Write a protein that binds this ligand. Structure first.
Ligand SMILES: Nc1ncnc2c1ncn2[C@@H]1O[C@H](COP(=O)(O)OP(=O)(O)NP(=O)(O)O)[C@@H](O)[C@H]1O
Ligand SMILES: [Mg+2]
Lengths: 309, 155, 141
């Protein structure tokens, strides 16, 4: 649990940075955090987010899932999961056509979360706006820190405030790309996530908030790089990926050179350098949004990540 | 033709950069150290990684061939972008082992006017060889191209 | 022009000036010195170099992989220049250093055309850098 506690402070630093900028303080761009109190090298205790439910439990529950309740005629969650695992040991083209076929018979229904919980139009608009701002802020910060393993069970949504909470932050600094099944998406922006943002989708509040968050990240590059440098040289911070962790994450029935490479990769992200070229805040945000919503990248991903969800 | 050539070269360059990137070496090094129940998962990873490698190599070859073809067409379609012959030669010299690239240079590159190759004549002559003669070989195409250029502009 | 691609910095006496901008060179430019025609022309030249970065990088790539191009320094050449009474990694590092020059990156930061030109002028005319140089270069001249 020490790794989770370390990630919580970075979220606090990201929260503190966002508060002191007038552009993001007006939009109330913040990151949901929970206290983690490690007790030993093997056991620990952490805060339980009361009033929060996993997004996977709300959407693709077998008994009373959102997809089953609203779209009985569509493919079930079990059916979609079974199909993806079958095409796992197949060609990339076969994977892509399977993913499109599943997505054709699996329409997002996540937009109904705010409708059934906030009948008042004024309250419903506030919660939807807060949800869109929360996703945009978390996605940019998660990309900056290279957060990975953002599957359905690792994301919590507050029932009262409709704000996403990210848990299980063990994978970070783009260690997810080192997995046997690489993470080709900087963050989770699946159809359910976009559908809950309204009819406008990623366009509008989500895109502007992502740009505003990126500007704060770029303006505080010297601060952000220094904080990560302190973390990466912590002897007790086991952020590097090992075969035991890699196999555990995806299961089915010199330290100095790595840290310097991660720091360089973080530095080029904060300056907008992606593929050796300088990209503006708007251009970088557009690239990140496009990569996350690209169906081809989602097809290559692990079925347990539930890209179709 | 130039716009398609530039984009195709950019995609090929991105794939080539990824292959030589330190991230690719770190990912490969993890599998090598992992391989040294347990045996079932190891032999799977040595099969998916080569499956990903063959797909990446095929994509690189397709992008490289398309870029070379479009660069030749752009050179034959005008004179404003004659400076891009350096990129066409750079792709050809660095990928002399590809039969498709050598065939396209023989079939279509011979129609390109010789005077466009004069500025980089020093590098073309320095790559002449004999060990790999053949009908589709790079050396024979290079020798025929160099001789044809010397035909038009001996001085 | 045998010495190029910053191979002079590898010499026993490193070349700390990008080019020769000594007092005699500046004095011949007029009373305005580096300010004016020299600075504007340097900015205009840098803009052309930046706008043709993909062209310039492509050309140098062809040159650096020439088997007969012995552009790398060797101890025999280094002692000959300053006398008193893996190739692939070396090729790649020069290309990366050339690429960051074309994009304005000097010390890891993005600099505009005007800012980059000012840095080059300041480095060349810096008396401290000229002192370290080999006197055979005649920095005072
Ligand atoms: N901080 C938290 N607040 C609320 N619920 C939580 C919290 N952490 C975990 N949960 C719940 O616990 C479930 C299981 O996740 P977790 O406790 O992390 O065990 P886990 O899935 O095994 N993670 P890991 O041990 O790293 O493989 C989640 O789906 C959440 O519903
Ligand atoms: Mg979990």
């Amino acid at each position: 649990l020490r790794q989770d506690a370390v990630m919580q402070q970075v979220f606090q630093m990201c929260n503190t940075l966002l508060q002191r900028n007038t552009e993001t303080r007006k939009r109330k761009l913040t990151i949901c955090t929970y206290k983690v109190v490690p007790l030993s090298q093997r056991s620990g205790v952490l805060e339980w987010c009361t009033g929060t439910v996993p997004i996977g439990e709300f959407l693709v529950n077998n008994e009373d899932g959102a997809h089953k309740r609203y779209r009985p005629n569509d493919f079930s969650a079990f059916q979609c999961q079974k199909k993806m695992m079958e095409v796992q040991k197949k060609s990339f083209e076969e994977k892509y056509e399977v993913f499109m076929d599943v997505c054709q018979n699996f329409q997002p229904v996540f937009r109904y979360f705010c409708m059934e919980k906030f009948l008042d139009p004024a309250i419903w608009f506030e919660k939807r706006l807060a949800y869109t701002r929360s996703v945009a802020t978390s996605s940019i910060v998660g990309y900056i820190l290279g957060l990975g393993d953002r599957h359905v069970q690792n994301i919590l949504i507050n029932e009262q405030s409709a704000e996403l909470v990210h848990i299980d932050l063990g994978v970070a600094f783009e260690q997810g790309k080192i997995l046997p099944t690489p993470e080709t998406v900087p963050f989770r922006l699946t159809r359910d996530i976009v559908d809950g943002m309204g009819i406008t989708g990623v366009e509008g509040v989500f895109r502007r908030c992502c740009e505003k968050t990126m500007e704060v990240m770029r303006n505080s590059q010297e601060t952000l790089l220094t904080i990560v440098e302190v973390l990466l040289y912590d002897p007790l911070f086991d952020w590097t990926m090992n075969p035991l962790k890699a196999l555990y994450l995806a299961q089915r029935p010199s330290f100095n050179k790595v840290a310097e490479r991660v720091l360089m990769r973080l530095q080029e992200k904060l300056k907008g350098v992606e593929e050796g070229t300088v990209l503006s805040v708007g251009g970088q945000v557009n690239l990140l949004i496009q990569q996350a919503i690209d169906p081809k990248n989602l097809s290559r991903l692990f079925p347990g990540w539930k890209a179709w969800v | 033709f130039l716009s398609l050539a530039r984009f195709s070269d950019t995609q090929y360059q991105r794939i080539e950069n990824y292959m030589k990137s330190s991230e690719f070496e770190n990912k490969q090094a993890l599998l090598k150290r992992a391989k040294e129940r347990y045996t079932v998962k190891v032999q799977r990873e040595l099969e998916l990684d080569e499956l990903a490698l063959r797909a990446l190599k095929e994509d690189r070859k397709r992008f490289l061939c398309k870029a070379v073809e479009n660069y030749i067409n752009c050179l034959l379609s005008g004179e404003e972008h004659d400076m891009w012959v350096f990129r066409l030669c750079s792709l050809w010299l660095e990928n002399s082992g590809v039969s498709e690239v050598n065939g396209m240079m023989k079939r279509d590159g011979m129609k390109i006017p010789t005077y466009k190759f004069l500025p980089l004549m020093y590098q073309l002559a320095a790559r002449m060889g004999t060990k790999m003669m053949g009908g589709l070989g790079f050396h024979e195409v290079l020798n025929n191209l160099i001789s044809r250029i010397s035909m038009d502009h001996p001085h």
